[PDB]
């Protein structure tokens, strides 16, 4: 029989820091980044309000 | 030095090395 009820789809993740490499192409970079390693950001300073 | 290690087949030391950096 049917009670007309709906299932609740979800996901669960534990024990894993979620990394973002600062690069435009995030993959296999690590140290020498694309965006946050440009010589443009060595000239001046900017604040981060999130 | 070529004398420093024990090598296979009458050759002191043979194949050179490379170790990876942490980030990636």
């Amino acid at each position: 029989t049917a009670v007309d009820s709906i299932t609740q789809k979800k996901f669960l993740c534990d024990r894993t820091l979620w990394r973002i490499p600062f690069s435009s192409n995030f993959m296999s970079m690590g140290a020498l980044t694309d965006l946050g390693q440009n010589l443009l950001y060595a000239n001046s300073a900017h604040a981060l309000d999130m | 030095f070529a004398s420093l290690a024990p090598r296979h087949g009458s050759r002191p030391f043979m194949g050179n090395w490379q170790d990876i950096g942490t980030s990636n």
Binding site: - | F1, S3, L4, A5, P6
Partner: protein, 50 residues
């Protein structure tokens, strides 16, 4: 004779601190460590046998 010292040295070195102090949370250990005249030590071993 390279990579083998035909002469007597030591592998493991034991010496207890001259001044130990028990207090509220911390437990200091100060000692004089001296490596042999022509010896090396990679600092992944140097521990405290408490």
């Amino acid at each position: 004779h390279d990579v083998t010292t035909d002469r007597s040295q030591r592998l493991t070195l034991r010496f207890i601190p001259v001044d130990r102090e028990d207090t509220a949370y911390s437990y200091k250990a100060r000692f004089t460590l001296a490596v042999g005249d022509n010896r090396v030590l990679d600092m992944a071993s140097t521990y405290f046998d408490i």
